[PDB]
Design a protein around this ligand. Structure first.
Ligand SMILES: [K+]
Ligand SMILES: [K+]
Ligand SMILES: [K+]
Ligand SMILES: [K+]
Ligand SMILES: [K+]
Ligand SMILES: [K+]
Ligand SMILES: [K+]
Ligand SMILES: [K+]
Ligand SMILES: [K+]
Ligand SMILES: [K+]
Ligand SMILES: [K+]
Ligand SMILES: [K+]
Ligand SMILES: [K+]
Ligand SMILES: [Mg+2]
Ligand SMILES: [Mg+2]
Ligand SMILES: [Mg+2]
Ligand SMILES: [Mg+2]
Ligand SMILES: [Mg+2]
Ligand SMILES: [Mg+2]
Ligand SMILES: [Mg+2]
Ligand SMILES: [Mg+2]
Ligand SMILES: [Mg+2]
Ligand SMILES: [Mg+2]
Ligand SMILES: [Mg+2]
Ligand SMILES: [Mg+2]
Ligand SMILES: [Mg+2]
Ligand SMILES: [Mg+2]
Ligand SMILES: [Mg+2]
Ligand SMILES: [Mg+2]
Ligand SMILES: [Mg+2]
Ligand SMILES: [Mg+2]
Ligand SMILES: [Mg+2]
Ligand SMILES: [Mg+2]
Ligand SMILES: [Mg+2]
Ligand SMILES: [Mg+2]
Ligand SMILES: [Mg+2]
Ligand SMILES: [Mg+2]
Ligand SMILES: [Mg+2]
Ligand SMILES: [Mg+2]
Ligand SMILES: [Mg+2]
Ligand SMILES: [Mg+2]
Ligand SMILES: [Mg+2]
Ligand SMILES: [Mg+2]
Ligand SMILES: [Mg+2]
Ligand SMILES: [Mg+2]
Ligand SMILES: [Mg+2]
Ligand SMILES: [Mg+2]
Ligand SMILES: [Mg+2]
Ligand SMILES: [Mg+2]
Ligand SMILES: [Mg+2]
Lengths: 136, 58, 94, 78
RNA sequence: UGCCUGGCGGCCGUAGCGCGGUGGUCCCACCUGACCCCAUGCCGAACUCAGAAGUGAAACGCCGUAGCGCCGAUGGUAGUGUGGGGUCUCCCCAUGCGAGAGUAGGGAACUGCCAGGCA
RNA sequence: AGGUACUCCGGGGAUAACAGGCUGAUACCGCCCAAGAGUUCAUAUCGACGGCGGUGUUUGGCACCUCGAUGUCGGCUCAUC
RNA sequence: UAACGGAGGAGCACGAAGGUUGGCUAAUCCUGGUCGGACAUCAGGAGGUUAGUGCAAUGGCAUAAGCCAGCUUGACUGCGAG
RNA sequence: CUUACCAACCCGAUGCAAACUGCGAAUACCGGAGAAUGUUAUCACGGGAGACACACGGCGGGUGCUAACGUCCGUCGUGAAGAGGGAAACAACCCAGACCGCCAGCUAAGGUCCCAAAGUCAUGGUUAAGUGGGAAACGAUGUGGGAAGGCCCAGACAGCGUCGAGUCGGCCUGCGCGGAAGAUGUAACG
């Protein structure tokens, strides 16, 4: 479960999630799993998809995770009223915009990369698509 | 010199204050009201600001 | 051997470019040398098939625009963020 | 529970009081600032809290000058 | 008039670094002495004074050179004022404004006043 | 400085407790992917890590209706979907 | 420019830590050096403010507002265009 | 010597920031000038107040669960204090601001088969689900369109060497299908 080792501040404004992604090319491997939709990826989701990916290729090749969950999310406990300060940090997310390459793979055939990425996408709350490296 | 005719085509109810002030500067008082104004860049700028609710007869 | 047919653009900017891509074309620019840059439109389907060949990005191409032939190299390409489409190409005069 | 926050200070109404081209009388404050984001040019003084004020009547003028590309405010006699 | 140098400015990296070369009649610098005017929380290192044997080594100036910094379009993209729309957490259309980054490319500053040397 | 369940007046649904409402975190019920368990065998039967919904049934959030009164838990009688 | 929104501070200090004149320039590291060590003082180099600011944070600061020294009381009284 | 090794620094490549900034808009705001328009719409002084419980909607946000017809700000609109027409019914949405009378006319939003005023209008397409007229991940030879590709009279694909004309599966895209259980009565087009 990824999570910043330390941060300047404990809590963060909700913010919004507009725009298209930066980092839309396969930059490290040969195959990538790219986001088509918009949303949040929790650290548990990122890790559940990593495990499914890694078991499918029998821990061969190499896998990059291009996203990191650096945004803390707070929640108010059950049976607590409104007010009395911001809630407690409960988990961490990465904000995803369309076009974001989420994972990359190398050192395996394309057919196996497609199958491994399919099993991973089934763990994620956002629609995705399989991409390959381009020369330009 | 040259003049143009401007007619108000939509209501002013609920428009932005700047838009109401522009209709005032053109002299337009109601839907269907037509005024005749000199053709200057200042007049053309006022028409441009409220072009969605006026029509020009060149 | 790669030949591309193009037209000179008669309208530029955000609105004109989005109307191009909604009509299955896309804009591009030819610059370099001492000639002024030339803004052109390409048919999206034809060029998207050609650029799938790796030699598109290494060879010297020919852009036929208004009858005249121009020798160029592909210099930069803007791709759609997640669809398999092209938004723009820079061509440098060769 | 309760919060350990909830404090703030009153707003200080800093910023530019007379913009470029404005005619001012001697003594008029041109900008209030913490430290010298703007520096005093011709016919302008710098107060103890780094307020820039006109030392003569005239028109406000902003300009970038010097080796550090610093911003200066001066008064053009009118 | 041209070349070279010193001083005071304009300008504030297209003007700054690096690398390579180059200049001593003059100017500049290092330099030579110091009982002194003056100076070192010790030191004539610095500041200061009295000088002119030596050297352009350092520094400085000048010339060269893209390894850098720096500057930088065109086109597209992002955003956005107004009006309209959708499947409305986000977008699209008409119109106006239009980046940042990156690309081609540019680029080894330019200039005013006075003074001195040389031709 | 305190107490009032011995209490009292003027007010408020401007404001809580019951029931309604909005909501659906929580709860409950479906589903998707399939690590595995199941001698072998993912899918007879279970389904880890994660994902998507439905209900309005729980615990709650809100304070919109009622404070010039909308009587409570359980039992009994009678039910209806 | 609000919330029982997110984070930190004050209820002083200083006759110099104030005035002025003259001067000065940081952190950190590397190398060599008696005791001496990861770290003391010395020398050179790299570096270029990554230091400093009586005390939070922000905006400033090289012409320094940072560091050192001499002399000092303008930490003056009455007023004050704007 | 060796590393299961860990590796800071620096170099190269990739992201993220309300309390990061070597960049940086649109708007907004301040000032000056000019025309046209506006019943001085501006400023000052004086007589009289009311008000200091706001609501919803749009946009930019904090909080909450990007829950609430929730809560707290900024800004615009309407309600409040505003009737008429539309959205079945529906303060706050859309159109539009009612001085009075008319058994005249043209339009707005929204509409034109009957209830119910006006096209059972014209032309070209799509859907077969009453979809239209409630919903997701995901599933599928539904069906329309488009650009490529593989194989094929040197006989493909299916069936069983035969057989003789197409065949295969990706991509993008329009409309539909399943996923889809609730309580008085059809009851999710009025
Ligand atoms: K240079
Ligand atoms: K009492
Ligand atoms: K008692
Ligand atoms: K729900
Ligand atoms: K619900
Ligand atoms: K279900
Ligand atoms: K009551
Ligand atoms: K029952
Ligand atoms: K002093
Ligand atoms: K002193
Ligand atoms: K509002
Ligand atoms: K009104
Ligand atoms: K139906
Ligand atoms: Mg924002
Ligand atoms: Mg636009
Ligand atoms: Mg403040
Ligand atoms: Mg000397
Ligand atoms: Mg030399
Ligand atoms: Mg630019
Ligand atoms: Mg040089
Ligand atoms: Mg008792
Ligand atoms: Mg009573
Ligand atoms: Mg209740
Ligand atoms: Mg309840
Ligand atoms: Mg109430
Ligand atoms: Mg309320
Ligand atoms: Mg009730
Ligand atoms: Mg009653
Ligand atoms: Mg009753
Ligand atoms: Mg206010
Ligand atoms: Mg307020
Ligand atoms: Mg000094
Ligand atoms: Mg001082
Ligand atoms: Mg103005
Ligand atoms: Mg009050
Ligand atoms: Mg109030
Ligand atoms: Mg309010
Ligand atoms: Mg809002
Ligand atoms: Mg809110
Ligand atoms: Mg409310
Ligand atoms: Mg709300
Ligand atoms: Mg009232
Ligand atoms: Mg009304
Ligand atoms: Mg009505
Ligand atoms: Mg009605
Ligand atoms: Mg009619
Ligand atoms: Mg009829
Ligand atoms: Mg239906
Ligand atoms: Mg469906
Ligand atoms: Mg029934």
């Amino acid at each position: 479960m990824l999570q910043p080792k330390r941060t300047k501040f404990r809590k963060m404004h909700k913010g919004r999630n507009r725009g298209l992604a930066q980092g839309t090319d396969v930059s490290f491997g040969s195959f990538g799993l790219k986001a088509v939709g918009r949303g949040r990826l929790t650290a548990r989701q990122i890790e559940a998809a990593r495990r499914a990916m890694t078991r499918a290729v029998k821990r061969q090749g190499k896998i990059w995770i291009r996203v990191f969950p650096d945004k803390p999310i707070t929640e108010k406990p059950l049976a607590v009223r409104m007010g009395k300060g911001k809630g407690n940090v409960e988990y961490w997310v990465a904000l995803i915009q369309p076009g974001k390459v989420l994972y990359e793979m190398d050192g395996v055939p394309e057919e196996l990369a497609r199958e491994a990425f399919k099993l991973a996408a089934a763990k994620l709350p956002i629609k995705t698509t399989f991409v390959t490296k381009t020369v330009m | 010199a040259k003049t143009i005719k401007i007619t108000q085509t939509r209501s002013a109810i609920g428009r932005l204050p700047k838009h109401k002030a522009t209709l005032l500067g053109l002299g337009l008082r109601r839907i269907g009201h037509t005024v005749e104004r000199e053709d200057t860049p200042a007049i053309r700028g006022m028409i441009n600001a409220v072009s969605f609710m006026v029509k020009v007869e060149e | 051997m790669f030949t591309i047919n193009a037209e000179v653009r008669k309208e530029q900017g955000k609105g004109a470019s989005r109307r191009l891509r909604a009509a299955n074309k896309f804009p591009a620019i030819i610059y370099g040398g001492k000639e002024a840059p030339l803004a052109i439109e390409l048919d999206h389907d034809k060029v998207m098939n050609m650029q799938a060949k790796a030699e598109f990005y290494s060879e010297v191409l020919t852009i036929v625009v208004d009858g005249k032939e121009i020798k160029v190299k592909a210099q930069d390409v803007q791709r759609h963020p997640y669809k398999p489409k092209l938004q723009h190409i820079d061509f440098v005069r060769a | 529970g309760s919060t350990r926050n909830g404090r703030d200070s009153e707003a200080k109404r800093l910023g530019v009081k007379r913009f470029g081209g404005e005619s001012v009388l001697a003594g008029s404050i041109i900008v209030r600032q913490r430290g010298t984001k703007f520096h005093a040019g011709a016919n302008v003084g710098c107060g103890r809290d780094h307020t820039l004020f006109a030392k003569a009547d005239g028109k406000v003028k902003f300009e970038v000058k010097g080796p550090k590309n610093r911003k200066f405010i001066s008064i053009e006699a009118e």
